[PDB]
A paper describes a structure:
Phytases (myo-inositol hexakisphosphate phosphohydrolases) catalyse the hydrolysis of phytate into inorganic phosphate (Pi) and lower phosphorylated myo-inositols. Here we report the identification of two HAPPs from the enterobacteria Hafnia alvei (HaPhy) and [name] (YkPhy), together with biochemical studies of their pH and temperature optima, as well as their phytate degradation pattern, which show that they are 6-phytases. The enzymes share a common catalytic site architecture located at the interface of the two domains involving the conserved N-terminal active site motif RHGXRXP and the C-terminal HD. The two-step reaction involves a nucleophilic attack on the phosphorous by the histidine from the RHGXRXP motif to form a covalent phosphohistidine intermediate while the aspartic acid of the HD motif serves as a proton donor to the oxygen atom of the scissile phosphomonoester bond.
The structure of Pi-YkPhy was refined at a resolution of 1.67 Å with two protein monomers in the asymmetric unit, each modelled with residues 6 to 414, and with very similar folds (rmsd = 0.22 Å). The overall fold is essentially identical to that of apo-HaPhy (rmsd = 0.96 Å over 391 residues) and is shown in Fig. S6 in the same orientation as for HaPhy in Fig. 5(a). Each monomer contains two Pi molecules in its active site. The first Pi superposes almost perfectly with the 6-sulphate from the HaPhy-MIHS complex. The second is coordinated by His126 (corresponding to His128 in HaPhy) similar to the 1-sulphate of MIHS, but does not superimpose with any of sulphates of the MIHS ring. The YkPhy structure is very similar to that of HaPhy, with a very close overlap of the active site residues, suggesting that it is also a 6-[name] in accordance with our biochemical data.
Numbering used by the authors: 6 to 414
Write the structure that this text describes.
Amino acid sequence: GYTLERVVILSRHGVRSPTKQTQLMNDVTPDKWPQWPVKAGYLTPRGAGLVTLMGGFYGDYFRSYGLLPAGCPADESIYVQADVDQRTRLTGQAFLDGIAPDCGLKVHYQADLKKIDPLFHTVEAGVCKLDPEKTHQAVEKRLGGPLNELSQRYAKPFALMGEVLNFSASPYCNSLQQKGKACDFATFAANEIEVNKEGTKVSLSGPLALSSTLGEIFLLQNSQAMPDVAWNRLSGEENWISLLSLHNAQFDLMAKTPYIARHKGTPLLQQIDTALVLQRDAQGQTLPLSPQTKLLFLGGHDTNIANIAGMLGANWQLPQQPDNTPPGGGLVFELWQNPDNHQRYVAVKMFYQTMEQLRNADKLDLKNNPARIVPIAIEGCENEGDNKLCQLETFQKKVAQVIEPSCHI
């Protein structure tokens, strides 16, 4: 039986309200968008509740492998570091409240909340720049051709989005008709990538970008347990998968394309790796970890998970969760050891709540209703057995190959 030595969780924050509403999001449907109980982008109180339920599951799971004891953890054995946003801070705290209730443990974060954290937003912080030509070339290579082919590649999902929106009856469609254009949702505008002149932001505009945002909104509505999701026009598991495939495609192109992913993800990959093996003074280990550290939780974003997955050549689909980087989901790194020969191994898993588990705020447990756990294959690793184990030396080698040296924190 192998020993679980240490764990790093790269978590998305929990259920949040939508990002700020734009005129375009309004104009592509005749219907009114449901209002939310919190400011744009904030974790909702129900979202914090769900994260706490997941924290409880994490606690049950890790305690089953003796990583943490019963009751309050040994001090300094869990470290929780969050990005500066409300949704990430509060997710970190909701996690602790679940995994170690009434233990006085606290989320930690950057001293100045009014500045970007380069660990979570490396390119934004100017650590390293994206070159516009290389970015365009890389996203072509990822996609397998020009952006105009997205309309065919995702024809059925785009048609479904237009249906869900009732796009044909929308102000945007009328503006097309008045110029003598048809109202094909897939081609309402061009898909275009823009790298700013500083090389500190890459943005996508057009139908894929919009559809990625809107599909997430619907998924959030459902996860928040709002009574009317997508105006009652979105039903069925395959429709959910198809609609969210636009969102996942947008994350693949904009966040997993290795040129972009390695620039954005180097600091987090190094922090993960160095925490996992507990090389406390190695380059890229940015946190005041103790020798007794057993578990690091990193409270971040879907983009962070995607960046890491793109660096590591990881790709997945989550049963009963159509967003690959879902609310409250965590990309979990486990260090295992064979006590017989001392060989160590890394395992990578997505831990997540299904749509139904989020909507119904299901209490989670190891036996009857567990969070879902999906083992993740890593490109160039042994991926051996059901747990897809990578030999530690192989994993360390892979990390060293895919980091961008210029993007060290």
